Fold protein (shiga-like toxin I subunit B).
Amino acid sequence: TPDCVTGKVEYTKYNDDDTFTVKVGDKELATNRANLQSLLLSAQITGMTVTIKTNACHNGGGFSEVIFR
Amino acid sequence: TPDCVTGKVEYTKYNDDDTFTVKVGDKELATNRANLQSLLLSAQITGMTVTIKTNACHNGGGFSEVIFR
Amino acid sequence: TPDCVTGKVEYTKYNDDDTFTVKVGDKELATNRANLQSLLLSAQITGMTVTIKTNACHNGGGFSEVIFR
Amino acid sequence: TPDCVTGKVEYTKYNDDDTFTVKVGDKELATNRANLQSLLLSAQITGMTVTIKTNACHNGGGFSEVIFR
Amino acid sequence: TPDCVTGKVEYTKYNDDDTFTVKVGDKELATNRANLQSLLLSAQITGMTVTIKTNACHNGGGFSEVIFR
Ligand SMILES: OC[C@H]1O[C@H](O[C@@H]2[C@H](O)[C@@H](O)[C@H](O[C@H]3[C@H](O)[C@@H](O)[C@H](O)O[C@@H]3CO)O[C@@H]2CO)[C@H](O)[C@@H](O)[C@H]1O
Ligand SMILES: OC[C@H]1O[C@H](O[C@@H]2[C@H](O)[C@@H](O)[C@H](O[C@H]3[C@H](O)[C@@H](O)[C@H](O)O[C@@H]3CO)O[C@@H]2CO)[C@H](O)[C@@H](O)[C@H]1O
Ligand SMILES: OC[C@H]1O[C@H](O[C@@H]2[C@H](O)[C@@H](O)[C@H](O[C@H]3[C@H](O)[C@@H](O)[C@H](O)O[C@@H]3CO)O[C@@H]2CO)[C@H](O)[C@@H](O)[C@H]1O
Ligand SMILES: OC[C@H]1O[C@H](O[C@@H]2[C@H](O)[C@@H](O)[C@H](O[C@H]3[C@H](O)[C@@H](O)[C@H](O)O[C@@H]3CO)O[C@@H]2CO)[C@H](O)[C@@H](O)[C@H]1O
Ligand SMILES: OC[C@H]1O[C@H](O[C@@H]2[C@H](O)[C@@H](O)[C@H](O[C@H]3[C@H](O)[C@@H](O)[C@H](O)O[C@@H]3CO)O[C@@H]2CO)[C@H](O)[C@@H](O)[C@H]1O
């Protein structure tokens, strides 16, 4: 799966449908994997660099793959 | 969904019905989303600014949408 | 539900029946809500003040309501 | 249940059968309670003193009762 | 189960199939145990030394056993 955006998490958002949005770089991307919520908030709090891989690389696009560095 | 309140979390409370209350600004709001409990307490401990979006913007109103900054 | 004890968490204990005991103030109180375990240990580690509300305000009494401040 | 060992956690280990081993003092003990995994690793990271209570107080013995101080 | 790699966690990755990859030493290894995701990310953030034991000791190999030191 290709890299879409790499960077620090600017903000996260919990959605009415239980999905979770993350803003990294110039894109807001959303995931339906509940296990990733606490992991992503942890990366945001600690300032980790994350890479989000997705073929839906556009604002509002979905993802499931994330590299935490 | 419109913004209701934005600010640091003053206190959180676990309710007898397993819902979770948060006090931000001048409003106590509650959520039935279990996944938000650990995320909100983490935001409270670390001093994050949160924005709660809800149409029930009154004391005791419910919500599901939260932006963590 | 009336306030029972307010203070820092002195110690916590995981019980054989999966309930969880917290000592706050002059009382040991126990809860059967699994979701509260990680929340309470977090309060203990970070030194938060908690208020436990319960009508069984005696040693070994049960609770479900907790305010994290 | 009698106290078995009190001390700081030296190391923890996740096992193939989903049990979790902890080395405290001179004993390696294991638990089948999944809820204790994140609580014990948190105690390990923060340097908390824990007391494990069990009648199987020997290497490889099981436990479920833990006091976090 | 034999020791495969020991070292600090270089990066972690959440996979489309809900498995979780860790890079330690010269190998990426992945686990299907959900419970390990938060524990491994915590090890990564705090700089713990982990030892992964597995008989599939090759890049992309699976594992379930990990020692956190
Ligand atoms: O969390 C939401 C969602 O994330 C992942 O799927 C993403 C999009 O939601 C999905 O529409 C997209 O589909 C791809 C095909 O996989 C690809 O073969 C084709 O070339 O393009 C479409 C549209 O871009 O895939 C992305 C991930 O790359 C995840 O796979 C999915 O289960 C779900 O978790
Ligand atoms: O966690 C509790 C609850 O939060 C969200 O719902 C909120 C209120 O509980 C709900 O009564 C309120 O409904 C609104 C409609 O959104 C609005 O379209 C209609 O005109 O008026 C009613 C009454 O105010 O909505 C808020 C959130 O905006 C969440 O949506 C719900 O699933 C549940 O989680
Ligand atoms: O986690 C254990 C338990 O906590 C809460 O219940 C507490 C006691 O376990 C329960 O015996 C006690 O019952 C009260 C009645 O609610 C009250 O109406 C009556 O007058 O007195 C009895 C005895 O004090 O209530 C406390 C909490 O106040 C929680 O409600 C329960 O679901 C369970 O989680
Ligand atoms: O997590 C594993 C396991 O821990 C707890 O049980 C422990 C041992 O695994 C169990 O064999 C042992 O049983 C004792 C009885 O307590 C005692 O009354 C009897 O006389 O002898 C046997 C020793 O062979 O007890 C320890 C804990 O004391 C936990 O109770 C169990 O449910 C399980 O979680
Ligand atoms: O999380 C993935 C997976 O991890 C553990 O299994 C590992 C490999 O996935 C599995 O293919 C490998 O199988 C071994 C046999 O156990 C061994 O008897 C034989 O000699 O070699 C094969 C191939 O290497 O075992 C490793 C762990 O050593 C875990 O056991 C499994 O449940 C699953 O969680």
Notes: The longest strand of chain B covers residues 9-14. Helices of chain B lie at 35-46. The pocket of ligand 3 is lined by residues B 16; C 1, 31-33, 54-56, 62-64 (CB under 6 Å). The radius of gyration of chain B is 10 Å.
